[PDB]
Design a protein around this ligand. Structure first.
Ligand SMILES: *[C@@H]1O[C@H](CO)[C@@H](O)[C@H](O)[C@H]1NC(C)=O
Ligand SMILES: *[C@@H]1O[C@H](CO)[C@@H](O)[C@H](O)[C@H]1NC(C)=O
Ligand SMILES: *[C@@H]1O[C@H](CO)[C@@H](O)[C@H](O)[C@H]1NC(C)=O
Ligand SMILES: *[C@@H]1O[C@H](CO)[C@@H](O)[C@H](O)[C@H]1NC(C)=O
Ligand SMILES: *[C@@H]1O[C@H](CO)[C@@H](O)[C@H](O)[C@H]1NC(C)=O
Lengths: 212, 248, 285, 204
């Protein structure tokens, strides 16, 4: 009645089966007092199920609530392309209404090699202390990735591990950029900057480079 | 206040006058149950109450010993043997608000008949059906308190009427709430009848030079016969002279 | 808060004799050169009243006496206030004093007299107290341990605010404040008579007619009462609140009234000069 | 349920309180209560307060008690959420929702969301860095406080597969709105408060 730790973390495997959305709690829940939600692309959520048994007004029969004790589950039979949002939880049986974390349901994509676009800084931005070298790893499905470089010994830290927030595309591909936020004094001191990423698809897809 | 949270205020140890309320030509209803509408300035009570609440025009009739309705049963229960008096008047000019006056509430749904002189401000979701509501609305469960929604453009039955239900009580304690005791002019040097607080009789009132102690009222002679009294209004000592008599 | 006052020297009490004192005015009637024989509740001449005191000797052990016990109120209480530093400041009348019934509260603090009737939750030892400040030369109030909670009250008689002295002057007692408390037909009558005194103890002989003071609209059942004293907490008494207090110097002569027939002598101005017991000796009979 | 609408993004600085409004269409307002919940990037939804319009009473949580002042406006069917002492950790999307009168309730409808991030330091315009080729079409948009920035490439002539990147919260007045299109063809970058044409021609 105080926490709603979500058991699943990612359901982007395949949108052609059911879901779990297990909303566990430390204390025993009341007589089926749980409310589900649906928030897509960071917008206004929508009410899904009240009482974990009945369907909400306007919500089709494509969903199905289950559970009567503490391990509540939400099964969505015949998952449709529209159901690509984050489902939350609301245990309204206790005094303080608390929420959970959710699960991002998306589509699956291959693990093809990313891109090695390199943009060395010009004289305008070099003397401004921002020797930015943007490198985005485009067209890779798994969010789990560790950006790495070849900054004069093995790699560097901070400037080579920016890891900007990669948005989701229509083909479930992402692109995290690692811009070199270092100063100009350290830029003309290292060796050729090779861009890559630690990934199961290809650990060294580096094709482009720039000396000094 | 509202109908479900009528705030009473007891007033004792005072000289209260009811002539400014009965002879006012400003109140709508002055139905005094039990006691008479007049002669109320001669009944000394122990402590009186004053229940205040705002209801509609068609709900003033429900404030009486013995009635049926949503207000007379679930909101305010007047006892069967009521000795006070109900006072009400129209207040549509200042209570109503253009666009809806949702500041005066009342209770529609309850679970049992209320008892006389009971104030229940509980706001739990009453179960209209047989299933336990457990504190959620939208499952055939209704909220007890409802809004009135006073609007100036309404009939006489949907107008605010401030009701002041004055209650009386004569307990074993000495009566404190008394009536206004009027007085007359000081008639002196004539065979008249005096009507002082504790003394009553006849005689000739004259001037006296006796200086009484500043805590007494009257004084008797050696044979337990009162002869000199003190005026209640002014701190003057009079001399009650026996009115002349004799035989022919 | 209810502070349990400790560190109090225990000793058996004493008893004195009321030498023809406690004869109030029976009725509100004026009379001159008459001998009226009333049948009201008075104090018998040469009675045996209990002698309470509250002193504080500065010896090795001394006598840290603070007498304020609950006494039965049968039909009347004659209360003397022989003191020199305004220690006694009021009483607490009631039946059980457990916040379950109405009780009478009559306090006389430095600001004004507060005569209220309520259902206070009185502590096991209610008392007042002032603290002497050395930095700022003044006698300000310190604590108010009369009660802890307050229910709905039915009477309030807050008088006009004034300022008392509250000084700890030493010497003989110079303030005698007699108080007779009665309860007949509900009306709880209160009598008072302030006469100068120049003695330490052993209340002297002399007649004193107590004039009526108030006729409060009360009548709640009263059976018991106590005493509200005030301790002068100086800078030489350290520790907690139950040990850091000085009893000062005070003594009261609470007595009990009973039905009796007295013969009073009214003077030319309606004042009582002497009285006859008519029950103590055949001469008075 | 009802069509709930909120106010606009009130971007302020730490040390200035604001009050978000929420209209009420459809049915009446003296019959259903409103509430407020925040949604921070990375955090979850935390209940803050719920005011009852008919009873004129409100509630508060255990971590937001005293620091918030939630009122209502029964004249125009609007709810007010005033938060004093807006600290830097109060960056969250505040949603408006209608609840049922009672001890327990659920948020059936939802509002729009208001951004009140307290990071106001200056009003610096966009500074598109001229990314020299090694060698593709890339333009780094940094050194700007106001988050809303429109990115494009020759107004659709080159905008094809341009994956947008959110801005990382820097120290103050700096945001990294990186944007690279897969390979005149200039990167048309605009700004919402002050439209400045800093489009650099660094195509290889
Ligand atoms: C009563 O009123 C009269 C006239 O108003 C006045 O002369 C008199 O002193 C008053 N008495 C008291 C006790 O107030
Ligand atoms: C009467 O007075 C004397 C005087 O000291 C006292 O000792 C005694 O206790 C009192 N009571 C009785 C019953 O003698
Ligand atoms: C009001 O006073 C009466 C008198 O004793 C008491 O019975 C009653 O409980 C009091 N009311 C409250 C709310 O305490
Ligand atoms: C007052 O209380 C006492 C006991 O406390 C009882 O004996 C007496 O009868 C009571 N008197 C009245 C009038 O209730
Ligand atoms: C009685 O009063 C008169 C005048 O009022 C006064 O001269 C006389 O002294 C008084 N008697 C006494 C014993 O005080």
């Amino acid at each position: 009645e105080i926490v709603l730790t979500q058991s699943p973390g990612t359901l982007s495997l395949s949108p052609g089966e059911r879901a779990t959305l297990s909303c566990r709690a430390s204390q025993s829940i009341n007589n089926r007092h749980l409310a589900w939600y649906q928030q897509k692309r960071g917008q206004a959520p929508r009410f899904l199920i009240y009482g974990a048994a009945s369907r909400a007004t306007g919500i089709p029969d494509r969903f199905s609530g289950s559970g009567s004790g503490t391990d509540f589950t939400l099964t969505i039979s015949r998952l449709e392309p529209e159901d690509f949002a984050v489902y939350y939880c609301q245990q309204y049986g206790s005094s303080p209404p608390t929420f959970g974390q959710g699960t991002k349901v998306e589509i699956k994509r291959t693990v093809a090699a990313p891109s090695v676009f390199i943009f060395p800084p010009s004289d305008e931005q070099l003397k401004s202390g921002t020797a930015s070298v943007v490198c985005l790893l485009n067209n890779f499905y798994p969010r789990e990735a560790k950006v790495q470089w070849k900054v004069d010994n093995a790699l560097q830290s901070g400037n080579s591990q920016e890891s900007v927030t990669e948005q989701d595309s229509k083909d479930s591909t992402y692109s995290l950029s690692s811009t070199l936020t270092l100063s100009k004094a350290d830029y003309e001191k290292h060796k050729v900057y090779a861009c890559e990423v630690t990934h199961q698809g290809l650990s060294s897809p580096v094709t482009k480079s720039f000396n000094r | 206040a509202s109908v479900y949270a009528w705030n009473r205020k007891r007033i004792s140890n005072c000289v209260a006058d009811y002539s400014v309320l009965y002879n006012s030509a400003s109140f709508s209803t002055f139905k005094c149950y039990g006691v008479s509408p007049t002669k109320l300035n001669d009944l000394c009570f122990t402590n009186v109450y004053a229940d205040s609440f705002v209801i509609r025009g068609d709900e003033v009739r429900q404030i009486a010993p013995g009635q049926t309705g949503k207000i007379a049963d679930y909101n305010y229960k007047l006892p069967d043997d009521f000795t006070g008096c109900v006072i009400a008047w129209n207040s549509n000019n200042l209570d109503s608000k253009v666009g809806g006056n949702y500041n005066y509430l009342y209770r529609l749904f309850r679970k049992s008949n209320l008892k006389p002189f009971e104030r229940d401000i509980s706001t739990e979701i009453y179960q209209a059906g047989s299933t336990p509501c457990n504190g959620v609305e939208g499952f055939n469960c209704y909220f007890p308190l409802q809004s009135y929604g006073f609007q100036p453009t309404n009939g006489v039955g949907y107008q605010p009427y401030r009701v002041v239900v004055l209650s009386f009580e004569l307990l074993h304690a000495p009566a404190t709430v008394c009536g206004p005791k009027k007085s007359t002019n000081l008639v002196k040097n004539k065979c008249v009848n005096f009507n002082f607080n504790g003394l009553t009789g006849t005689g000739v009132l004259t001037e006296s030079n006796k200086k009484f102690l500043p805590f007494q009222q009257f004084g008797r002679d050696i044979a337990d016969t009162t002869d000199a009294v003190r005026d209640p209004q002014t701190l003057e000592i009079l001399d009650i002279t026996p009115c002349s008599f004799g035989g022919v | 808060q209810c502070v349990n006052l400790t560190t109090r020297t225990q000793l058996p009490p004493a008893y004195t004799n009321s030498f023809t004192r406690g004869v109030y005015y029976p009725d509100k009637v004026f009379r001159s050169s008459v001998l009226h024989s009333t049948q009201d509740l008075f104090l018998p001449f040469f009675s045996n009243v209990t002698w309470f005191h509250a002193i504080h000797v500065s010896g090795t052990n001394g006598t840290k006496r603070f007498d304020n016990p609950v006494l039965p109120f049968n039909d009347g209480v004659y209360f003397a206030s022989t003191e020199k530093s305004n220690i006694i400041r009021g009483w607490i009348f009631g039946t059980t004093l457990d916040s379950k019934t109405q009780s009478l509260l009559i306090v006389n603090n430095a600001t004004n007299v507060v005569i209220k009737v309520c259902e206070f939750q009185f502590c096991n030892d209610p008392f007042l107290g002032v603290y002497y400040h050395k930095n700022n030369k003044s006698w300000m109030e310190s604590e108010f341990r009369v009660y802890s909670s307050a229910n709905n009250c039915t009477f309030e008689y807050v008088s006009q605010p004034f300022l008392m002295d509250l000084e700890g002057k030493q010497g003989n007692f110079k303030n005698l404040r007699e108080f007779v408390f009665k309860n007949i037909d509900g009306y709880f009558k209160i009598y008072s008579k302030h006469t100068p005194i120049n003695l330490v103890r052993d209340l002297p002989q002399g007649f004193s007619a107590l004039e009526p003071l108030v006729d409060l609209p009360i009548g709640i059942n009263i059976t018991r009462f106590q005493t509200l004293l005030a301790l002068h907490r100086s800078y030489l008494t350290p520790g907690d609140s139950s040990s850091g207090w000085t009893a000062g110097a005070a003594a009261y002569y609470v007595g009990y009234l009973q039905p009796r027939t007295f013969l009073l002598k009214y003077n030319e101005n309606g004042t009582i000069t002497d009285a006859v017991d008519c029950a103590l000796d055949p001469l008075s009979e | 349920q009802v069509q709930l609408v909120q106010s606009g993004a009130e971007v302020k600085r730490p040390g200035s309180s604001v009050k978000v409004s929420c209209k009420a269409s459809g049915d009446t307002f003296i019959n259903y209560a409103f509430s407020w919940v925040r949604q921070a990037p990375g955090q979850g939804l935390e209940w803050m307060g719920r005011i009852i319009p008919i009873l004129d009473i409100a509630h508060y949580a255990q971590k937001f008690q005293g620091r918030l002042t939630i009122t209502a406006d029964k004249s125009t069917d609007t709810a007010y959420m005033e938060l004093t002492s807006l600290k830097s950790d109060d960056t969250a999307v505040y949603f408006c929702a209608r609840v049922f009168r009672g001890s327990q309730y659920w948020f059936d409808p939802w509002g729009q969301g208001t951004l009140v991030t307290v990071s106001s330091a200056s009003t610096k315009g966009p500074s598109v860095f001229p990314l020299a080729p090694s060698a593709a079409l890339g333009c780094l948009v940094k050194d700007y406080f106001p988050e809303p920035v429109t990115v494009s490439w020759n107004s659709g002539a080159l905008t094809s597969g341009v994956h947008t990147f959110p801005a990382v919260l820097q120290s103050s007045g700096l945001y990294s709105l990186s944007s690279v299109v897969t390979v005149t063809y200039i990167c048309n970058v605009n700004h919402k408060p002050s439209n400045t044409k800093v489009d650099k021609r660094v195509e290889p």
